[PDB]
Amino acid sequence: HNLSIDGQPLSLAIYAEPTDPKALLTSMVQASQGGSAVLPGTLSLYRF
Amino acid sequence: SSAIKTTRLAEAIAGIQLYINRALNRIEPNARADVSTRQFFTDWTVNN
Fold it and tell me: Which residues from chain A sit within 8 angstroms of residue B1, using beta carbons?
């Protein structure tokens, strides 16, 4: 198994270090918005 | 193991050395005792 006489391994291992942290972002989300509608108006008694 | 390496000539040398040791030490039967008395096998203490 390729070990020394006292059992120490004779090969140096590698691990392929994990790939960095992860950045997380937020964004504004906008939705369609309408406006009000108008109705016919009443005729007042006073002048303009 | 798959970790240990060698060469073709080195492995052939090791195989023939093992075979000679087994034949000389009477471990494998029917070994030709007349052949086992040559100068090479008589000096096998340094030719091994």
Answer: 1-2
**Token representation of residue A22:** 């992860």
Resolution as reported, in Å: 3.1
- Specify the 3-state DSSP secondary structure of A28: coil
Q: What are phi and psi of A19, to 5 degrees?
A: -85, 95
The residues, any chain, with a CB within 8 Å of residue B22's CB and separated by 6 or more, are: B28
Is B1's CB within 8 Å of A1's CB?
A: yes
d(CA B40, CA B37): 8
Method: cryo-EM
